[PDB]
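Subject: Protease 3C structure
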Amino acid sequence: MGPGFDFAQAIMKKNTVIARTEKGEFTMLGVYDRVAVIPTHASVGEIIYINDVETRVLDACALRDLTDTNLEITIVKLDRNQKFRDIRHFLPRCEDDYNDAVLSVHTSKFPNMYIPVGQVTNYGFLNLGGTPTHRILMYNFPTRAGQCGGVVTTTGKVIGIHVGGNGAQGFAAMLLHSYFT
């Protein structure tokens, strides 16, 4: 409907796949080559389904900060026959607050879903499902089950992936350029 939705759509149409684990179906953001991200609660194993095709996992790393605190991002390298468009130049270099973000989801349950979430706070610490988690972004939108792995964008930047909510607020794990060197 506007330039924010334009940027979000451009990312969704080229840089997402539907990932299925034993814990559910998730929006999955491809970043470059065969490297993608997913929330760590997806519990990626040795095999994952990508757009309903059985795919070997070549590597999976659940990221933690240098305080040894959960970040809720898993970086996955996929044994896929096709590379993602390289979008690492859209990743922020530092922790930050944002205006006028969009959360975009594409699954069987919610195809072609876009949500204008407004202001995004650098929230920092969150007890996420009982797990201390750092680098959390917050937005004041009542997100629901099915939106985990959703991509959070502003015009020009891919800033996070949705990892939870409390009924009134939604929470995303930051994406930083330094995770994908």
